[model samples]
Target: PRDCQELFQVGERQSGLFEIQPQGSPPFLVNCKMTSDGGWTVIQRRHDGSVDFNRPWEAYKAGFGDPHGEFWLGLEKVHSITGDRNSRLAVQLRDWDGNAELLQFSVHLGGEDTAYSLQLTAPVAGQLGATTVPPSGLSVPFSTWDQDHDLRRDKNCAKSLSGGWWFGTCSHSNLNGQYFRSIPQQRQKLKKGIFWKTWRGRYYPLQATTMLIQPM
Candidate 1:
């Protein structure tokens, strides 16, 4: 199938593993997250920290982790799927308090040569409501421990933050960060936790996060 939305429309309402072949790309396995709104192809999922997100450039490029559990869908595959079309990005976040929020963006990614830089527009809050500020990682190149593409010349954002992501002056969002079993009290350790600054603030480590994408 082309995407999870197509599968959802065809009555594959159950959210699970599905193989999708975007135009001009080979078929690949992805976790489809079905909801009342639509079927979303999960690009990243973090919860129990079973999969380590801290890795070199090649690992993020090719992808890693189990499709049924915590995983990243990979930059190359993400680019291949969203490269030729306009796609919407969905950020589903949940805190330890059981509160949830969703953030949506009209987004796309550059090719590997461009470091898979994220280009986002029209940031909007989902049903749960979120802050008014725009995300900080816009137009930033994806950075890894080995490949320093972040804005900071002296500091590797991936290395400092403990994850690979599109970082600009570090970032206010790092869904790929280290998963803390509970909120870290130390101020310095806060940067290492999975966070979305616009919602739960920078210090609070989020309980869960899921990044999803779909063709517009």
Candidate 2:
């Protein structure tokens, strides 16, 4: 397979298509490409076939994009911080070997939307520790089982929740202390600070620490 040049190319990235599910909303279709310099470029497109990130900060203030303010995309930190679910945006990106890299896009809003410096930082999908993942068909819990088994501390969170899976840990409050307030009537808001997701019965830790923001 080493000779398969296509396998090593950017567009053909092994992780294939990943999803960025905004809380209480629909999922976004995402694709990844490796830059010629070894960095990654991710594209998130609208269902209507338009680029999500059409306007930068300058263009946005003048009221320039779709709906005059919508945005999308990511490179290291993707486009602008456009959507938030429970004040948290979680993304799962895989690598050439099927390993996972989880990114947290924590949203912090100020009077001026353009002032915040948001970032999306995930591991080199391929660099996740091999020992952390189990062989196919086996299941792992979302949190650390033992004192020394802290998956989050080790940045072992990569695998995410399966579609339609229930997150019991979630509440109607946004854990980031911003965004939505604790509203009992609104059950869709996620209140938990940490999360673990699974597929085929295997669980993986989700963290608030793995990603960050630079709010001024």
Candidate 3:
């Protein structure tokens, strides 16, 4: 059932056990990229003008990059977000170009705090990526990331996190070209901190957000 439905959200998801979703704020979908072989990635810039791997599309593909300075791996593509086990997201691909074999991702939150909760429900018989749809644009945050400190720009806290909408106030590296975008999702939620005013604060030590593509 790869055709479930894809979207970005910031409102409240229906809770089965901890069923206490806020009224109805409408789950917003963000812009993103997907590949064949089931790989999903969140495209978000980091604090202090950097980027964070929203999900582990790169990690799962075992892409090459500076491991010391990255996020988590998309380890679970069939996990649960509401069931007993952690949840996984059903991936939707862009209509024009979405090749499953070209996916590889990792998270910025590399340790136990990395973004590992994810999955895609594989039905016994359905269309190949039947439910797959194109992603939207960057909301106000990263879909997944490190332990909430302050680097995240979507939420509060006094510090800086590694993923979210940033303006690049510290580094001097020009982007490849046209700015990419996502949806209405919030920056990963975290507690309070002391660097909200600065993206180059403690949370964001590195100054680069990487995106690696694998050709099938």
Strongest candidate by lDDT? 1
Ranking by TM-score: 1, 3, 2
* Superposed model 1: Cα runs more than 4 Å off: 122-138, 183-187
lDDT (Cα, tens digit) per residue for candidate 3, span 1-216: 121112112322321111112122222222233333332223222222222333223343232222233332222311121222222323212211322221232212111233332222233111222243333211111122333323556853212322221212212111111122322234542211112222233222222233331111
Cα-based lDDT at residue 63, candidate 3:
25
Give the Cα error of residue 159 in candidate 2, in Å: 34
Worst 10 residues of 3 by lDDT: 170-179
Query: What order do you get sorting by lDDT, best first?
Result: 1, 2, 3
Which residue pairs come into collision in candidate 2? Answer: 73-79, 74-78, 75-78, 171-191
lDDT of 1: 0.80
Instruction: Give lDDT tens digits, candidate 1, residues 1-216.
Output: 788988888889788999889888889888898889788889999888899988899999989998878999899988887875678888899999889898777766788888888765425322223344365433668889899875546866788788798775565688888889875677678788888777988767888999999877
What is the per-residue lDDT of model 2 for residues 1-216, given as tens digits with 9 covering 90 to 100? 111122334245453344444334344443333324221323221222122222233332322223211223332122222332113334453322356555544333322332322222222111221233232211211111111112355431111211111112222111111121222343422322222233211122222211222211
TM-score of 1: 0.86
